Amino acid sequence: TETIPDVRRLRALQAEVHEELTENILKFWATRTHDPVHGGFVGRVGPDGRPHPEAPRGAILNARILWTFAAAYRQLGTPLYREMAERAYRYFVRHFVDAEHGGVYWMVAADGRPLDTRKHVYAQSFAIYALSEWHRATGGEAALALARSIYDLIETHCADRVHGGYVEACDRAWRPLEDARLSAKDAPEPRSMNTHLHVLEAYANLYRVWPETELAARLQALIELFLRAIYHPATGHLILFFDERWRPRSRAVSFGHDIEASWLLLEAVDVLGQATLRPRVQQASLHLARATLAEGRAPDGSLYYEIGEQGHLDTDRHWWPQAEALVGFLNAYQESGEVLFYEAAEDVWRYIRERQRDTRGGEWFARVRDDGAPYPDDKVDFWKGPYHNGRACLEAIQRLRHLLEHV
Numbered sequence: 001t002e003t004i005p006d007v008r009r010l011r012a013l014q015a016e017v018h019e020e021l022t023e024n025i026l027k028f029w030a031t032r033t034h035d036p037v038h039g040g041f042v043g044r045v046g047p048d049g050r051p052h053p054e055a056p057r058g059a060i061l062n063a064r065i066l067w068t069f070a071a072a073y074r075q076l077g078t079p080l081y082r083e084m085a086e087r088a089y090r091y092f093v094r095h096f097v098d099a100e101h102g103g104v105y106w107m108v109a110a111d112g113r114p115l116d117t118r119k120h121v122y123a124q125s126f127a128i129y130a131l132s133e134w135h136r137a138t139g140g141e142a143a144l145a146l147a148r149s150i151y152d153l154i155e156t157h158c159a160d161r162v163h164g165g166y167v168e169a170c171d172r173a174w175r176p177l178e179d180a181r182l183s184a185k186d187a188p189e190p191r192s193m194n195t196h197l198h199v200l201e202a203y204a205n206l207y208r209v210w211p212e213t214e215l216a217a218r219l220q221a222l223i224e225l226f227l228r229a230i231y232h233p234a235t236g237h238l239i240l241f242f243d244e245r246w247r248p249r250s251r252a253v254s255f256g257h258d259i260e261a262s263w264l265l266l267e268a269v270d271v272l273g274q275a276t277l278r279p280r281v282q283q284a285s286l287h288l289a290r291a292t293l294a295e296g297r298a299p300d301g302s303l304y305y306e307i308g309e310q311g312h313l314d315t316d317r318h319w320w321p322q323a324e325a326l327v328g329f330l331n332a333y334q335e336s337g338e339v340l341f342y343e344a345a346e347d348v349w350r351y352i353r354e355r356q357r358d359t360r361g362g363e364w365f366a367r368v369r370d371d372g373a374p375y376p377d378d379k380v381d382f383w384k385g386p387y388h389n390g391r392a393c394l395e396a397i398q399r400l401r402h403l404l405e406h407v
């Protein structure tokens, strides 16, 4: 009773995805973004494709570059990907890693000088995620050891052992900050789903290479936090911001976060080997997936951005929700066997190919308006790396590979 797309469609999609990753995404990053003046990678590329070697450089972006090239190398073996990953790692370790207090600085000047020394848990997570993947790809012990130390700092300095979860920002010396906002866009609240999602993601990847008992407990406690506090069963959306006791302090809905958490939650529970908890996760995850399917999609299959605090639907197509839906809908299909999820995956991909992709300038447009008009946003900046789209492509290729083997 398996309803599965025929081999031709499965393979056709997988080839376009592979082509997109290697010939557009990873090609753009390998050639436009390496910086030969300060080493490492540029912190910004404007809409016209101009790299900015003197732009300030965020840890998150640089961790994302590291993760993506490391992941691509592990799965595809292209020596250039290791080389690019190595370039990212060296700069990262030299300049972003705080050798005195531990963890990674928020932002450095292009030459490497600390510019914003705060220790944000979101950035610490991406560091762990990236270092753990580099370790997976190469077996480097320093990367793993650095990954472990950052974990230790988060638990030591940020863990709320009364209420679950984490204080999200500290100063350089690991003293809690009042303002935990990632940006001006975020609510001034003590807890955010966004930051806790990436702790989970980081910890799940670290657990792959360091299956330590206490990490397992921390990982499971985050999954449990998501099921009991962040995921809303009545709506099928993640609540975005909370106080310290996880009381909702927000009503906005973010479709891209929903669909990302949908597959991440499952990956995390399966990394953990937690069979007793898996049914509840699969249920929350399929719900997240359906809710996005029902409420977050334009008629062309692409995802809207969010519903704001006042209820306003932002219809802009940002690059990363499309990427995350690609994986989230393929995952929902693998989990439930319902082919409507496959069709949704195909719809979003066609949108990516037809609208999101910047064919002229390479890579993907950050934002596309509801009328199909691309905004003249930066191609690369603090918040736009190769991770969402690079990962989405790697995941889809591997997931399609498994489906193909149903024959």
Ligand SMILES: O=C[C@H](O)[C@@H](O)[C@H](O[C@@H]1O[C@H](CO)[C@@H](O)[C@H](O)[C@H]1O)[C@H](O)CO
Pocket: 182, 183, 184, 185, 186, 194, 257, 260, 320, 383, 384
């Ligand atoms: O997985 C989801 C991500 O964490 C998103 O939150 C990221 O989006 C960026 O979020 C920040 C903080 O809210 C915004 O200031 C920024 O404009 C968004 O692009 C996603 O990784 C994209 O960077």
Ligand SMILES: [Cl-]
Pocket: 064, 383, 384, 385, 386, 387, 388, 389
């Ligand atoms: Cl990214």
